[PDB]
Amino acid sequence: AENLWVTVYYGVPVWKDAETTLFCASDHNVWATHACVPTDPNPQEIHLENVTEEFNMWKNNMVEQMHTDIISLWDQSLKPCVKLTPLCVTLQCTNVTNNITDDMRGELKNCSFNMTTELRDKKQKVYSLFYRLDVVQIKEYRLINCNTSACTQACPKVSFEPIPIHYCAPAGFAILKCKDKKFNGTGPCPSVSTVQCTHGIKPVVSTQLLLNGSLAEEEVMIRSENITNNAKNILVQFNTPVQINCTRPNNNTRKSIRIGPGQAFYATGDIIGDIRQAHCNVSKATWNETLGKVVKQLRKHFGNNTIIRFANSSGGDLEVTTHSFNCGGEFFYCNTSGLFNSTWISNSNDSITLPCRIKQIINMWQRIGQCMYAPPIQGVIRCVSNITGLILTRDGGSTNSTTETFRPGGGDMRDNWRSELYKYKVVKIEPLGVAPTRCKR
Amino acid sequence: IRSENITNNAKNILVQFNTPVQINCTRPNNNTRKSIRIGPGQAFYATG
Amino acid sequence: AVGIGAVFLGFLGAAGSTMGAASMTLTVQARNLLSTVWGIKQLQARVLAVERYLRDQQLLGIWGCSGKLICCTNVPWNSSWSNRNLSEIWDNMTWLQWDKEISNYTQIIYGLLEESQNQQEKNEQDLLAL
Amino acid sequence: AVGIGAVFLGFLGAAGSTMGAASMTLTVQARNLLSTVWGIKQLQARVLAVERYLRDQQLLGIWGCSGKLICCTNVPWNSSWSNRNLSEIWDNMTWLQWDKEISNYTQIIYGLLEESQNQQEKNEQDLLAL
Ligand SMILES: *[C@@H]1O[C@H](CO)[C@@H](O[C@@H]2O[C@H](CO)[C@@H](O[C@@H]3O[C@H](CO)[C@@H](O)[C@H](O[C@H]4O[C@H](CO)[C@@H](O)[C@H](O)[C@@H]4O[C@H]4O[C@H](CO)[C@@H](O)[C@H](O)[C@@H]4O)[C@@H]3O)[C@H](O)[C@H]2NC(C)=O)[C@H](O)[C@H]1NC(C)=O
Ligand SMILES: *[C@@H]1O[C@H](CO)[C@@H](O[C@@H]2O[C@H](CO)[C@@H](O)[C@H](O)[C@H]2NC(C)=O)[C@H](O)[C@H]1NC(C)=O
Ligand SMILES: *[C@@H]1O[C@H](CO)[C@@H](O[C@@H]2O[C@H](CO)[C@@H](O)[C@H](O)[C@H]2NC(C)=O)[C@H](O)[C@H]1NC(C)=O
Ligand SMILES: *[C@@H]1O[C@H](CO)[C@@H](O[C@@H]2O[C@H](CO)[C@@H](O)[C@H](O)[C@H]2NC(C)=O)[C@H](O)[C@H]1NC(C)=O
Ligand SMILES: *[C@@H]1O[C@H](CO)[C@@H](O[C@@H]2O[C@H](CO)[C@@H](O)[C@H](O)[C@H]2NC(C)=O)[C@H](O)[C@H]1NC(C)=O
Ligand SMILES: *[C@@H]1O[C@H](CO)[C@@H](O[C@@H]2O[C@H](CO)[C@@H](O)[C@H](O)[C@H]2NC(C)=O)[C@H](O)[C@H]1NC(C)=O
Ligand SMILES: *[C@@H]1O[C@H](CO)[C@@H](O[C@@H]2O[C@H](CO)[C@@H](O)[C@H](O)[C@H]2NC(C)=O)[C@H](O)[C@H]1NC(C)=O
Ligand SMILES: *[C@@H]1O[C@H](CO)[C@@H](O[C@@H]2O[C@H](CO)[C@@H](O)[C@H](O)[C@H]2NC(C)=O)[C@H](O)[C@H]1NC(C)=O
Ligand SMILES: *[C@@H]1O[C@H](CO)[C@@H](O[C@@H]2O[C@H](CO)[C@@H](O)[C@H](O)[C@H]2NC(C)=O)[C@H](O)[C@H]1NC(C)=O
Ligand SMILES: *[C@@H]1O[C@H](CO)[C@@H](O[C@@H]2O[C@H](CO)[C@@H](O)[C@H](O)[C@H]2NC(C)=O)[C@H](O)[C@H]1NC(C)=O
Ligand SMILES: *[C@@H]1O[C@H](CO)[C@@H](O[C@@H]2O[C@H](CO)[C@@H](O)[C@H](O)[C@H]2NC(C)=O)[C@H](O)[C@H]1NC(C)=O
Ligand SMILES: *[C@@H]1O[C@H](CO)[C@@H](O)[C@H](O)[C@H]1NC(C)=O
Ligand SMILES: *[C@@H]1O[C@H](CO)[C@@H](O)[C@H](O)[C@H]1NC(C)=O
Ligand SMILES: *[C@@H]1O[C@H](CO)[C@@H](O)[C@H](O)[C@H]1NC(C)=O
Ligand SMILES: *[C@@H]1O[C@H](CO)[C@@H](O)[C@H](O)[C@H]1NC(C)=O
Ligand SMILES: *[C@@H]1O[C@H](CO)[C@@H](O)[C@H](O)[C@H]1NC(C)=O
Ligand SMILES: *[C@@H]1O[C@H](CO)[C@@H](O)[C@H](O)[C@H]1NC(C)=O
Ligand SMILES: *[C@@H]1O[C@H](CO)[C@@H](O)[C@H](O)[C@H]1NC(C)=O
Ligand SMILES: *[C@@H]1O[C@H](CO)[C@@H](O)[C@H](O)[C@H]1NC(C)=O
C-alpha cells in the first residue's frame, strides 16, 4: 500500500565524532616551520544554518596532539649542537660584591675551574659567573644537575620566540568551529561553521598567567570542568589585556671557551657597571579593575553575598610556585605575591613592581634527566607583554566558612593549549544514506 | 622422532616426549649487591 | 546579465538545507573523500582513507548500484521504519535529522538489499539459461 | 521456532563443500580481501594488498564483468579443456580439485574472453553508429 521503496545516496552531508591526525599550515626557531606546509592566503569558512552541535573542551583530542607535537619539535631542535659533558668539575667559588645592592647579595658566584682543550693532552684554567640556584656546595661547589644526568646546552642560533601554527585536517574529515559568544566550553552551540583549519596559535609557555593570548568578545569568562569540585582548576579569560613590562638591567658580557674540536662553551665574563635585580611592572588601577570584574563574575557561581579572597600560592617547586616565562632568551621566575593579595566583600600612576630571579639550567617540561643550559644574553633586556587570562584554584571549599579563597596555579601546560582550542572540534563524514523514493528496479 | 634426513648423520634429530621430566636447579649462595656511581646518572652493580 | 556575481558551493554548504536540495550536491562531498614518524602517520592516514573508500565502493557494488551516486532499488519501504510521508521528508527535514531518526533500522535494510540483489541475480541467471 | 540456535559461516568455511554449494558463499571471501621498520613492513603489506585488489578489479572490468561476483559470458566451453558433464562438476567436485584439473588451460581462456569482449564492444559501437 505504501508503494515507497528504498534508495541509496552516496555523498550525503552527515558526520560523526571521530579522532584523527591534523597536519601543519604556517606562514632559525625552536618550533621548526620547515616541516610545516605553507598556509593559504585566503582561508575559507562556511556558516552552517540550522545546525546546533555539542561541544566539550575537557575531552578534546587536539590538545594532546598539540602537546605531543610541541614536545617532539622541542626534542628535535636540541639535537645538532654541543653536549656539556665536561662541565662537571670541582669549582672554586667566591662571592661577587662589586657594586651590588642589598637584595642581590649572594645571588652571584664567581667560580674558577679547570677545563679541557682541543688537544686531549692539555688543560686550561677558566672562570665564570654562576647563579646561586645553579651551584650547590659539595668553598667547593658543583653544578646542580651532574648528580642526575649530563645534559646539553641551548643552541645559540635558534630563537625561542613563538610563532603561529595552524592545524588542518586530512581528506574525509572536517573541523567545526563554534561562534556562539558566552560559550563556557561545554554544552550545545547553536551557531556553527566549517573551517578548513584554525587561526594561528602561538605556543606560549608560561605559568600562573596566560600571555599573548586571546581576549573574550563579550566579558570576563570563567570555565571549569566541575566548578563545585575544588580539585579542578579554573580558567579565567579577560575581555581586555593588562600590560606588563619585564626587564633584566644588568649589562652582561659573553665569552667563548674552546672545549674540544668544534665545541665551544659560552660563559659570562663580567658585568659592566652596577648590578641590580631583574623585575617586572604592572599597572595598579588596571589590575584592580580586572580583579573587580573577575570577582563580579565569580559571584555569579559562588553566591551574591560571599566574601572573595585572593591569596598567595601554597608552595612546592619554584616553577609551580612562581610565574615562570622566557623574556629575551632569559628564563625569568617571578613572585606574583603583590597581585593575589586582597579581600572583596559584597556591597594614579604608581605601578606594582615584582622583583624576581633568572635561571640558566632549565627543565622545561615535567621530566627528570634532561636539562637545557641557556647561554647568557649580552646586554640589557626589556620586554613588554599582555596578560589576558589566569589559572586559579579554590582553596579548601568546606561549608564551615562562608568565604572562598582563590590562589594562582599552573604547572601543567595542557591548560595553556586548552584556552585556545576550546571552540574547535573534528568530525568525519558518513557519505552513505538511505531514503524512500518511488522507483523500482 | 623427527629429522630432515635420518639416514644422513649431519642432520640433528629432534625428540619430543609425551610426558615431562621435572628438573630442579639452584644457586644457594647468599649474594649481596652494591651500587657504585660511575658518572652522571650511571650506576654499576657489584657483588659485595 | 551585467551586475550579478557567481560563486561555488563549499564542502558542506548544503548541511543545513533540506534533503531534496541537499541531494543535488553529492559530487562535492564524493570528490573530497579521495583528496620520519610524521611521514609514517601521514602514510597510514592516506592508506586508511583509501581502504575506507574501497570498502564503501565494494559495499555499493554488492547491492548492484556500482558506479552510481543515486540508485533507487526494488526493496519496498516498511512503515515501521518511518511513518512520515514524502512531503514531510524531502521538503521539511535535513539529512542529519533523517539519519538520527532511522539510525536503528539500517542493518536490516542492508541485509534486505543484499538478499534482494542475490535473488535478482539468481533470477537473471535462470532467465538467461533459456 | 524455539530450540535451535544460529551461527555464521566463517572464512574459508566452504572449502570442502562442492562447487555448487561453495558458489553461494562468495561474499565472505570477497570481503576478507580488503580487510619503525615494522611500520614500514605493515604499510608495504597493506599497499601490496590494495594493489592486488585493484589489479583483480581491473582484470574483471577488462572482460566486461565489472562490479559482479558472478558473470557468465558468451565464450563457448571447449571439450578439450574438460570432458566432464555438469552433474559430475557442480555436485561431485570441489573448487580446489577443479582448479588443479584445469590449471594448464587458463591463459587461453583469458585471452578468448578478452577477444570476445573486444569484439562485442566493437559490434555495439558499430550498431550505435546507425
Ligand atoms: C608577546 O609578544 C611581544 C610582541 O610580539 C613579544 O615582544 C617581542 O619579543 C621579541 C623577542 O624578544 C622582540 O624581538 C627582539 O627585539 C630585540 C630588540 O630589538 C632584538 O635585539 C632581537 O633580535 C635578536 O634576537 C634574534 C632572535 O630572537 C636574533 O635573530 C637577532 O640577530 C638578535 O640577536 C642579536 O642580538 C643578541 C643580543 O645582543 C645577541 O646575543 C645575538 O648574538 C645577536 O647579535 C629580537 O628581534 C620584539 O622586539 C618584542 N616586541 C615588543 C613590542 O616588545 C613578547 O616577548 C611576547 N611575550 C612572550 C612571553 O613571549
Ligand atoms: C672573578 O674572578 C676573576 C679571578 O679572580 C677576576 O679576574 C681578575 O680581575 C682582576 C681585576 O680585578 C685582574 O687583576 C686579574 O688579573 C683577573 N684574573 C684573571 C685570571 O684574569 C674577575 O674580575 C672576577 N669578577 C668579578 C665580577 O668579581
Ligand atoms: C686546576 O688543576 C691544578 C692542578 O692540575 C690545581 O692545582 C692543585 O690544587 C690542589 C688543591 O685542590 C693542590 O693540592 C695541588 O698542589 C695543586 N697543584 C698545582 C700544580 O698547583 C688547581 O687547584 C685546579 N683548579 C681549580 C680551580 O681547582
Ligand atoms: C562535582 O564535584 C562534586 C564534589 O566531588 C561531586 O559531588 C560529589 O560526588 C561524590 C560522588 O561519589 C559524592 O560522594 C559526594 O558526596 C558529592 N559531594 C557533593 C558536595 O555533592 C559532583 O558529582 C561533581 N559533578 C559531577 C557532574 O560529577
Ligand atoms: C618599574 O618601575 C620602576 C619605578 O617604580 C622603574 O624605576 C625607574 O626607572 C626609570 C627608568 O626610565 C628611572 O629613570 C627611575 O629613576 C626609576 N625609579 C626608581 C624609583 O627606581 C623601573 O625602571 C620600571 N621597570 C620596568 C621594566 O618597567
Ligand atoms: C610599559 O612600557 C610602555 C612602553 O615602554 C609604556 O608606555 C609608554 O608610557 C609612557 C608614559 O605614559 C608614554 O609617554 C609612552 O608614549 C608609552 N609608550 C607606549 C608605546 O605605550 C607603559 O606605560 C609601561 N607600563 C608600565 C606598567 O610600566
Ligand atoms: C605569600 O605571602 C606569605 C606571607 O608573607 C609568605 O609567607 C612568608 O614566607 C617566608 C618564606 O619565604 C617567611 O620568611 C615569612 O615569615 C612568611 N610570612 C609570614 C607572615 O609568616 C609566602 O611565602 C608568600 N608566597 C610565596 C610563594 O612566596
Ligand atoms: C614573595 O614576596 C613576598 C612579599 O615581599 C615575600 O614576603 C616577604 O618575605 C620576607 C622574607 O624575608 C619577609 O621578611 C616579609 O615580611 C614578607 N612580606 C610580607 C608582606 O609578609 C615572600 O617571601 C616572597 N616569596 C619568597 C619565596 O621569598
Ligand atoms: C596587547 O593588546 C593590544 C590590544 O589588544 C594590542 O594592540 C592591538 O594590536 C592589534 C594587532 O593585530 C591591532 O589590530 C589593534 O588595533 C591593536 N589595538 C590597540 C588598542 O592598539 C597589542 O598589540 C598587544 N600586544 C602584544 C605584545 O600582544
Ligand atoms: C640422505 O643422506 C644420504 C647420505 O648422504 C643420501 O645418500 C647419499 O647421496 C649422495 C648424493 O650425491 C651420494 O653421493 C651418497 O653415496 C649417498 N649415500 C648413501 C649411503 O646413500 C640421501 O640421498 C639423502 N636423502 C635424500 C632424500 O636426499
Ligand atoms: C639436590 O639433591 C641434593 C641431594 O642429592 C640436595 O641436598 C640436600 O638438600 C637438602 C635441602 O632441603 C638438605 O636438607 C640435605 O642435607 C642435602 N643433602 C645433601 C646430601 O646434600 C639438594 O638440596 C637438592 N637441590 C635441589 C635444588 O633440589
Ligand atoms: C656570600 O654571601 C652570602 C650572603 O650574604 C653569605 O651567606 C655567604 O656566607 C657569603 N660567602 C662568602 C663570603 O664566602
Ligand atoms: C642530587 O643532589 C640534590 C641535592 O644535593 C638532591 O636533592 C638530589 O636528590 C640528588 N639526586 C639524586 C638522584 O639523589
Ligand atoms: C556552562 O557549563 C555547564 C557545565 O555543566 C553547562 O551545564 C551549561 O549549559 C553551560 N552554560 C551554558 C550557557 O550552556
Ligand atoms: C653595555 O656595555 C657596552 C660596553 O661597554 C656599552 O657599549 C653599552 O652602551 C652598555 N649598555 C648600556 C645600556 O649602557
Ligand atoms: C598584602 O595586603 C595587605 C593588606 O592588608 C598589605 O598590608 C600587605 O603589605 C600586602 N603584601 C604584599 C606582599 O603585597
Ligand atoms: C641471606 O642473608 C640475609 C641477610 O643476612 C638474610 O636476611 C637472609 O635470610 C639470608 N638468606 C637465607 C636463605 O637465609
Ligand atoms: C533553516 O530552518 C528554517 C525554518 O526552521 C527554514 O525556513 C530555512 O530554509 C532553513 N535553512 C535552509 C538553508 O534551508
Ligand atoms: C566430503 O566427502 C564425502 C565423500 O567424498 C561427502 O559425502 C561429503 O559431503 C564431503 N563433505 C562436504 C562438506 O560436502
Short mmCIF file of C-alpha atoms and ligand atoms in Angstrom, two decimals, chain B residues 28-32, ligand 17:
data_model
loop_
_atom_site.label_atom_id
_atom_site.label_comp_id
_atom_site.label_asym_id
_atom_site.label_seq_id
_atom_site.Cartn_x
_atom_site.Cartn_y
_atom_site.Cartn_z
CA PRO B 28 72.43 -21.39 47.05
CA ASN B 29 74.92 -18.56 47.67
CA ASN B 30 73.53 -15.58 49.60
CA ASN B 31 74.77 -12.85 47.27
CA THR B 32 74.88 -9.16 48.17
C1 LIG E 17 70.65 -14.07 53.27
O1 LIG E 17 71.18 -13.02 54.10
C2 LIG E 17 70.18 -12.09 54.57
C3 LIG E 17 70.92 -11.02 55.33
O2 LIG E 17 71.61 -11.55 56.45
C4 LIG E 17 69.15 -12.83 55.42
O3 LIG E 17 68.14 -11.91 55.81
C5 LIG E 17 68.54 -13.98 54.63
O4 LIG E 17 67.67 -14.74 55.46
C6 LIG E 17 69.63 -14.89 54.07
N1 LIG E 17 69.06 -15.94 53.25
C7 LIG E 17 68.75 -17.15 53.73
C8 LIG E 17 68.16 -18.12 52.74
O5 LIG E 17 68.94 -17.46 54.90
#
